[PDB]
Design a protein around this ligand. Structure first.
Ligand SMILES: [Fe+3]
Lengths: 197, 212
């Protein structure tokens, strides 16, 4: 009949799992609370934005970020769980990069933040590998015909960030000013940094 | 495993539920949502009960209709719970007692996995490679769209990791391999039915062979 299995409320199941483990001494004091804090406060696309703004204003760092992403990220102390081997991929006037995990949700957590619901969606996982131009267009990003789109499928341990092109009209901006226009979606590759009118 | 989780290239889905830079809300949209990852880390790092690869595989082992109607964080809760039961740490009875109702788990594995391949090749940037035309019923980190396809090496990793097809089953023979960023032309993967340029897949050495 293709029907769903009967299930207790998900909150009840999730807390049951916690209580079953915690009741056996298997979860250290403050353990899940500590991870929650890390997930909410430390893992952040602000970190990736900082890296981009530095790369944009420092040719030496840009070169390091593109050749040894891990080393570059380590300078800021931003290595972490699901972000131990980093590769940054460079957008150019003829190339737009986009990241996905078609098999699940793999994402460079420490520098992009945990993946959002849309990135984990079956829609994004199925479609972006095959029709990235249409997907980006629907999301609000038009990529011209003479730009190649390259989709990176995060299938192993490499964790990716996009280094977008620096937009015109940002000449001489400070790192703080540049950081502001580099969003989570810019780092994933579905958005291009926007300069206010 | 040729499961429903191998979604790349599937046709018929609608719009991605996002427009660029739209508000995505808080990291967690419910008070339980930090639990799957934090309990996975307890299992991996504190208990040493399973690997992250085992978590990916147990989620792949969800009954297909169940997988398709379950949100991501819930799949993870189900996966971690299943692993805790399979490894003998918890019982399903105590989970359902604490939950106050049904707590169906992923299906048992139908494969014992496979070891890291004995015979592999160290590839160089610029080399042409073909993805081995192999079918693996257990865990594998090769999406089906690239099976048997030819591409070029863009990167060989400077680190090595256990072979997923082994460690995803908790085997002792996962060894270690580097992975390769293999660039495929869109037309190699989807013929005329793609609007893309290239796709780069991060493939373990043991999934590859020289082209020709
Ligand atoms: Fe993933």
């Amino acid at each position: 009949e293709n029907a769903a299995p009967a299930q207790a409320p998900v909150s009840d199941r999730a807390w049951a799992l916690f209580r079953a483990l915690d009741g056996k001494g298997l979860v250290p004091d403050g353990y899940v609370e500590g991870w929650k804090k890390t997930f909410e406060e430390d893992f952040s696309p602000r970190r990736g934005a900082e890296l981009v703004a530095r790369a944009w204003t420092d040719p030496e760092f840009r070169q390091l970020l593109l050749t040894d992403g891990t080393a570059a990220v380590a300078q800021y102390g931003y290595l972490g769980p699901q972000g131990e081997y980093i590769v940054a991929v460079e957008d150019t006037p003829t190339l737009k990069n986009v990241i996905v995990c078609s098999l699940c949700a793999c994402t460079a957590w420490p520098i992009l933040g945990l993946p959002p619901t849309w990135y984990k969606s079956f829609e994004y996982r199925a479609r972006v590998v095959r029709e990235p131009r249409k997907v980006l267009s629907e999301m609000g990003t038009e990529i011209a015909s003479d730009i190649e789109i390259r989709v990176y499928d995060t299938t192993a341990e490499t964790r990716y960030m996009v280094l977008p092109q620096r937009p015109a009209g940002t000449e001489g901006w400070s790192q703080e000013q540049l950081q502001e226009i580099v969003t989570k979606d810019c780092l994933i590759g579905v958005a291009i940094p926007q300069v206010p009118t | 495993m040729d499961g429903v989780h191998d979604l790349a290239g599937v046709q018929g889905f609608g719009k991605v539920p996002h427009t660029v830079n739209a508000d995505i809300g808080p990291t967690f949209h419910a008070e339980w949502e930090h639990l799957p990852y934090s309990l996975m880390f307890a299992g991996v790092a504190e208990l040493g009960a399973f690997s992250v690869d085992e978590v990916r595989y147990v989620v792949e082992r969800m009954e297909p209709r169940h997988y398709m109607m379950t949100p991501y964080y819930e799949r993870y809760v189900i996966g971690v719970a299943t692993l805790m039961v399979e490894k003998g740490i918890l019982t399903q009875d105590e989970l359902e007692s604490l939950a106050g109702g049904p707590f169906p788990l992923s299906r048992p594995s139908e494969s014992e996995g496979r070891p890291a391949p004995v015979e592999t090749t160290t590839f160089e940037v610029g080399q042409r490679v073909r993805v081995r035309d192999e079918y693996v019923p257990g865990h594998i980190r090769m999406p089906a769209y690239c099976r048997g396809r030819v591409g070029t090496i863009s990167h060989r990793t400077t680190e090595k990791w256990p072979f997923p097809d082994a460690i995803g089953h908790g085997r002792n023979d996962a060894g270690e391999e580097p992975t390769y960023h293999v660039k495929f032309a869109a037309e190699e993967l989807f013929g005329s039915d793609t609007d893309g340029g290239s796709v780069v897949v991060d493939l373990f050495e043991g999934y590859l062979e020289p082209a020709a």
